[PDB]
């Protein structure tokens, strides 16, 4: 659980023209377009905490980190650079392991999907911050992603061969 600046979050929402009004205990997905790790999209799932357990307002609001993969299609999503989102979400950083891949934390690479097109692997800056279990989970996920990528490259090579053939005989 870390500090949450409500005022800055409101500004962040309005700048994106989002008419949404998030609640207390609201689960929000974040698409970090860039950060210290370079300029490649990463994900993090947070929860807003405005009050206590008895619903009395906290004069110092918080947000907690939920350890789950962000699903951009079924979840409320804010996108933007880390620096900008840190104005609201204080000390915000990448989540543990493959979770940082978001919709690809489970290693599901889909042809035609923009989130699969935007996916980039871990940098050596990221790995220096990871534990062994963390590093294994990332490597397992990247392996699954690669398997899909290799199958997709064979399919491409087969279709390209077939289309050049069809073009040759119809030209």
């Amino acid at each position: 659980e870390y500090e949450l600046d409500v005022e800055a979050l409101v500004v962040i929402l309005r700048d994106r023209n989002i008419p949404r009004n998030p609640l207390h205990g609201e689960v929000i997905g974040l698409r970090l377009t860039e950060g210290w790790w370079g300029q490649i999209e990463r994900f993090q799932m947070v929860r807003l905490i405005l009050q206590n357990d008895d619903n009395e307002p906290l004069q110092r609001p918080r947000y907690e980190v939920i350890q789950r993969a962000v699903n951009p299609h079924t979840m409320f999503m804010i996108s933007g650079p880390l620096a900008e989102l840190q104005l609201a979400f204080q000390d915000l950083d990448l989540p543990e392991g493959p979770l940082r891949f978001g919709p690809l934390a489970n290693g599901h690479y889909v042809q035609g999907d923009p989130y699969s097109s935007s996916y980039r692997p871990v940098t050596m800056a990221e790995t220096a911050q990871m534990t062994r279990d963390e590093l294994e989970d990332v490597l397992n996920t990247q392996s699954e992603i690669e398997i899909q990528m290799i199958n997709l490259l064979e399919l491409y090579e087969v279709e390209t061969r077939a289309l050049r053939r069809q073009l040759a005989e119809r030209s």
Binding site: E7, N55, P57, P61
Partner: peptide
């Protein structure tokens, strides 16, 4: 009673 961001800001 869950609050919104505006419901907290006007406080």
């Amino acid at each position: 009673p869950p609050m919104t961001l505006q419901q907290w800001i006007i406080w």
